Write a protein that binds this ligand. Structure first.
Ligand code: PRP
Ligand code: PRP
Ligand code: MG
Ligand code: MG
Lengths: 178, 178
């Protein structure tokens, strides 16, 4: 797919970042090349419409890199975007959920009125690694009695088995690296 | 202006967050209402085209809330978006710039290869308060020899004199509160 190639060729892979042996997949060049960004958003939107039809009510974008994609994806689908943030950032009543990040723990948070019970959401982030971040997002959304139809990302690091961590919630990525 | 009203009516104010006496202007409902989000992006894009014609090379979006607007604004203008991040997040050689956040210090960071000398940039963030964050972004861009044509936000807190802090760099906000 030439569209997918426009995204793939704009992923920059940095070895030994942040630690030796780990390859960092930098999406910055996708953002910097408007054709690449448009392609990525288009491919995600097409997948989501083909898979869910009119079922999606909202996109949820994950703080922080997921914010780069959530609003554009929502816009392309004619939907709003709700936010899931690192804890401490959002005003008003919230729920929060811990997850494991590198060597310690972190928490995500959502405003209690972000969604109503029964609303259907797709979560977007830039990259799925261990699945911890996305899993915390799904937990929060479930606690608002929202239905998570799918999680999606531009990049998936398949050797880390994030897909399995999210099951039974469906997952889709544009690009896969071991 | 009904377009501007679509944005204004989706700002939610929270007293005493995160500290007593201040009012947090929550842009979440702008993101959640696709018409509101489209209006905000459109108003910013129209202003920028009206003020700079075709001279803008890139949008720079600021981590984290600014990420919600940078790519969409860039896309509307047919431009790429470059990233300025909280320090520690970007791979490759970087520059960083400290600024005063609440009671302590934070740092923004940019990849050394993010822009070439002479390239023309408009910085976008959700909110201008003291101007510390935006000012740090301008410092980083200037240290890459980029030309900052303008900084823009959805919300400006005028009593904090952020505009003055940025001068002589032009600034534009959609909405103003004390
Ligand atoms: O699948 P996981 O193992 O949880 O890792 C994936 C997450 O890691 C990165 O975010 P990071 O926490 O580095 O924060 P950022 O958004 O501030 O870059 C990335 O943007 C994902 O959100
Ligand atoms: O003009 P200033 O006084 O610098 O304040 C404005 C900045 O403050 C907020 O960011 P915050 O640091 O709260 O981080 P966030 O983007 O993670 O919410 C806001 O999104 C601006 O970036
Ligand atoms: Mg992240
Ligand atoms: Mg910010």
């Amino acid at each position: 797919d030439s569209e997918l190639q426009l995204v793939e060729q704009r992923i920059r892979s940095f070895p030994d970042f942040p630690t030796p042996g780990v390859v960092f997949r930098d999406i910055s060049p996708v953002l910097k090349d408007p054709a690449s960004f448009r392609a990525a958003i288009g491919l995600l939107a097409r997948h989501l419409k083909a898979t869910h039809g009119g079922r999606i009510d909202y996109i949820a974008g994950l703080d922080s890199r997921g914010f780069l994609f959530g609003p554009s994806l929502a816009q392309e689908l004619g939907l709003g975007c709700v936010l899931i943030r690192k804890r401490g950032k959002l005003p008003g009543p919230t729920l929060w959920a811990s997850y494991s990040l590198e060597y310690g723990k972190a928490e995500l948070e959502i405003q209690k009125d972000a969604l109503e019970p029964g609303q259907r959401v797709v979560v977007v982030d830039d990259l799925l690694a261990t699945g911890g971040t996305m899993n915390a997002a799904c937990e929060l959304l479930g606690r608002l009695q929202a239905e998570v139809l799918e999680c999606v990302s531009l990049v998936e690091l398949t050797s880390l088995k994030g897909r399995e961590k999210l099951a039974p919630v469906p997952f889709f990525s544009l690009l896969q690296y071991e």
